[PDB]
Design a protein around this ligand. Structure first.
Ligand code: VED
Length: 188
């Protein structure tokens, strides 16, 4: 077959029930995730190939960056609660990996302030129990699939993308086949 279990994707031994249709995990400390987001724009290219209105979920992970890595998961929960993901994704990636000016929770907060999020607005969400639940959601999702590495993408909580089975000769070709695989899986 053109698509085969173990080539472009893998099947989860224990399927996860009720998971998001398309769920990808990432870390602002993850170098591959930087390439995925800023150079390849994988998520946006996957979204453009799925049926309009499909649910695309993106969660941060804890297992990179120790203390800061957990602050970034809470900061991503803040971004999700306020709906400012598209405003802080770039500066956070570059703050951590390009300029390396993000070394504390306050430095993370600076990115939101510079992005236009009001100070009181950010601090209220940071300490809100809505955000604490969003943090638990992200952790539960990663735990459900026994996530040990990022970047990663799962489809309907049963199939896991295998980026190792694609050609990296061409930036655009790699993205296209990745997105086509997600489409194929979502139609399974
Ligand atoms: C077209 O030019 C470019 C320009 C910028 C980046 C890339 C590029 C190429 C190859 C990969 C691979 C697979 C591999 O390492 O073989 C991964 C990856 C993804 C998720 C998890 C893991 C893991 O194993 O944890 C690895 O990300 C890649 C990114 C290519």
């Amino acid at each position: 077959a053109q698509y085969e279990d173990g080539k472009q994707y893998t099947t989860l031994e224990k399927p996860v029930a009720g998971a998001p249709q398309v769920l990808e995990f990432f870390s602002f400390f993850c170098p591959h995730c930087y390439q995925f987001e800023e150079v390849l724009h994988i998520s946006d290219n996957v979204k453009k190939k799925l049926p309009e209105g499909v649910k695309m979920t993106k969660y941060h992970v804890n297992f990179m960056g120790g203390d800061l890595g957990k602050d970034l998961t809470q900061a991503w929960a803040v971004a999700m609660a306020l709906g400012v993901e598209d405003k802080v994704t770039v500066p956070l990636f570059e703050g951590v990996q390009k300029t390396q000016t993000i070394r504390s929770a306050s430095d993370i907060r600076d990115v939101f302030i510079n992005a236009g999020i009001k100070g009181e607005e950010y601090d209220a969400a940071w300490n809100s129990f809505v955000v604490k639940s969003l943090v638990a959601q992200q952790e539960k999702a990663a735990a459900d699939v026994q996530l040990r590495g990022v970047p990663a993408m799962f489809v309907n909580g049963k199939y896991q993308l295998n980026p190792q089975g694609m050609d990296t000769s061409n930036m655009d070709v790699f993205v296209q086949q990745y997105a086509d695989t997600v489409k194929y899986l979502s139609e399974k």
